Design a protein around this ligand. Sequence first.
Ligand code: ADP
Ligand code: MG
Length: 682
Amino acid sequence: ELAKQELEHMRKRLNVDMNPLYEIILQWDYTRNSEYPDDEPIGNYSDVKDFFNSPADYQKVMKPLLLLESWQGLCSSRDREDYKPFSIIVGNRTAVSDFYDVYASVAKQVIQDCGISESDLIVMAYLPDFRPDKRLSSDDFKKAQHTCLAKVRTLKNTKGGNVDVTLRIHRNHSFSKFLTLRSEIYCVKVMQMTTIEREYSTLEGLEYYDLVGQILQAKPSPPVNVDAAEIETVKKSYKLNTSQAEAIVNSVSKEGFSLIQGPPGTGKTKTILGIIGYFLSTKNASNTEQLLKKQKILICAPSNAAVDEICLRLKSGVYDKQGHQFKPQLVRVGRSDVVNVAIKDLTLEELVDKRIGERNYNYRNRDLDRRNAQAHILAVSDIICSTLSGSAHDVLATMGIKFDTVIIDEACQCTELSSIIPLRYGGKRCIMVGDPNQLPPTVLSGAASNFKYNQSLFVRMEKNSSPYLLDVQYRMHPSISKFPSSEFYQGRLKDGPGMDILNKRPWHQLEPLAPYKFFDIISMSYTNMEEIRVAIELVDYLFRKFDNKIDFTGKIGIISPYREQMQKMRKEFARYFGGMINKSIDFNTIDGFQGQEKEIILISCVRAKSSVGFLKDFRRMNVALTRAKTSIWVLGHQRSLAKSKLWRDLIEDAKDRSCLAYACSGFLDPRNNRAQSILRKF
Ligand SMILES: Nc1ncnc2c1ncn2[C@@H]1O[C@H](COP(=O)(O)OP(=O)(O)O)[C@@H](O)[C@H]1O
Ligand SMILES: [Mg+2]
């Protein structure tokens, strides 16, 4: 009929009560030494299921895991973050629901120096025997008998450079006996609560989300049928390959979820730029004038860096279905992490500054002018970019706009609740673009990740549906892409034209500095010195032969599965080469290197159980083998690796392709008889 319940469900999704969240957290014990926030039985926790039966089912599983990760956030800040303590003078209190709101005062300089805002959780402690003689730290709070968590509710600047604070605590907490009028109470920040609150909102409002069924069942919509001519038109107009054009036309033509799988270097972000232009132009091509809200598209990614990349790439405009550029109005919601004038000029705050000028350089007017400008800028916008978390910001929630279409880049690098946040504005189409063949996003709680909390929604949906695959890679030399294609993509991942020309390098003319080589080191620990020695000797040969012609600054990375090996690798490289290699070689584990790439990569394999185990090894090998563009030198002991199918496949593939070399310390030295004798007899 007439579904005014859309407005009612919108209202529910945007006004979830946070009090139940703080009913839990404000009864936690900051001093608790545990992986878990309380002593409830471990069986209250369970794995993220592949398939959920209802919103209540989802909430039963997911809420403990969200709170577990939040607990670990408290512990990590307590045990590492060295937040700076301060003190307050207590005033009156007011009972509200299951809470006390406690009023206090503190100097503005202290609020600034200690970085306190209305988003923060703090901890209070009673430390009557403290003397200013000593420096106070969060260790003093961790060891204190009497502590109490408090949520900063309100901060109001007063006349004398002071601030009126409202702190919220739990009614039940015995610490209120210390909060007598005019008492001095010591405090330290625990953590910012914004990210948690937004995820909790999504979790608890889930039943009202338009796409709740597809979420619970992790079931994207079925493909519809699309015109071949339309795909050809998009291919030509957007300068895309076939797989990219198919992914755009199919995913925009249907409602609900679509998954676009992009291996390394296959144009995930480029395809999103095509989605934006194609969506906006086909939507713009659908007795007094009616007033309509302007269609928008909401574009998100997990991190500030990924959002800024999209923003930067949109500044060259987007294109309509006929290939003509147009310049839609773009707003970046949320300040970025980095400083970039290109990104700054797109942020809502700067667009407001430019819209209102120096008129208010009187405070009533300044705030009003800013709010009117904000409303105008958002109303006339075509594209809103934000992080997933930032999509929940007040500035979007107060626009009165349905974002029926949401696009998510880097969609495998977020927890599930995070990917759902932007769907709260009536999301009926969600196109998620990601690479599932990488390590899952890092979470602080190992216990939570053992329950699969570290799994994206994309990955859960991939179990039930085949994504649109982007099948041409534009980064790696063909000798480097060959085995990843055959081993992980059925040989169907192609190279862009001229990958051999683009990635040809001068050292490729000197064996064994080839584009692709497995070095079988002829020689239950997690380190191997002989692999380090061979890595050093390869890089030394490279440098001796080429560093009077080529600047190796930023060109090399050395990775391994194991941190023990990389500690030893860095130590030996530092001893042998001294400070001269700092700017040339980055050292990390495979896991730590996931978002990085280099012209030259050396892998120290060291050595090679379950399905969870095989999955982590599959992801690590996908990552390791795609980090290099021009040269990848894989160092290992064949017998110590061949118990893994992945490594045995890699080694036998390399033999088949004549890309296996025998190595040992001294093998590049013709005068080293001891080494040439080891080699010769082989
Ligand atoms: N269809 C294409 N034709 C030519 N180059 C392409 C194509 N698609 C992607 N590329 C190139 O691939 C590289 C990575 O593109 P990008 O959109 O950053 O991919 P990803 O987001 O998947 O890392 C860029 O150099 C881009 O120009
Ligand atoms: Mg990208």
